[PDB]
Amino acid sequence: ASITAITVENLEYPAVVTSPVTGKSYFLGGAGERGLTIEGNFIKFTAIGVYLEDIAVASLAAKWKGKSSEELLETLDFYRDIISGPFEKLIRTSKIRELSGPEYSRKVMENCVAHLKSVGTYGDAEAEAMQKFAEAFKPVNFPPGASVFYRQSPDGILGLSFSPDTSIPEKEAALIENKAVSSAVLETMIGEHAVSPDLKRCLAARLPALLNEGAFKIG
């Protein structure tokens, strides 16, 4: 049962969390830094952490038990099972430098629209969903330490939550009810065409120990 907390620029990601929204419990799959490769110096803007619902271990165990971290990292099918598995995923982006909602959401929505176009599932319903996605961010500003939570439900729903700190809000700001879009965000982070592989590495490193257990139980 060796899953640990991760800290990204003084922003702490606890090893386990329990949603006040769903009542489900999640474990930390990985965490890293994001920013811009601009002005010659790398400037950290956000931290990202990916949480998997506790039942994910039992679900992933069948196919991936006994595999090594090196092998998992090189296997696309592993991350597809994570992206599209029958369990909730919870992503937490924490700000290191202040960003408005539209400022932060710009690049995130670009990647999603790009992905949805790549795989040929960007129709009217998905464009509207991405519109509802944008609107959720417009009235919000993110000082340092403030967080956005993406709750990806396997039922094809994406819940957005904003917090002034790292704790999960009781209510969600919006519900994007679209299957293609619901998984789009996580795809841009650990999918095949994900630019930074730091989260892919983190997941590959942490899961094999859990998968040998056969299941994950908080407490």
Curated annotation (Swiss-Prot):
MF-aspect GO terms: chalcone isomerase activity
Highest taxon above the source species: Eukaryota
Catalytic activity: a chalcone = a flavanone
pH dependence: Optimum pH is 7-8.5 with 4,2',4'-trihydroxychalcone as substrate, at 25 degrees Celsius.
Site location (Important for catalytic activity): 104
Family stated for the protein in its record: Belongs to the chalcone isomerase family.
Record's protein name: Chalcone--flavanone isomerase 1
Gene this chain is encoded by: CHI1
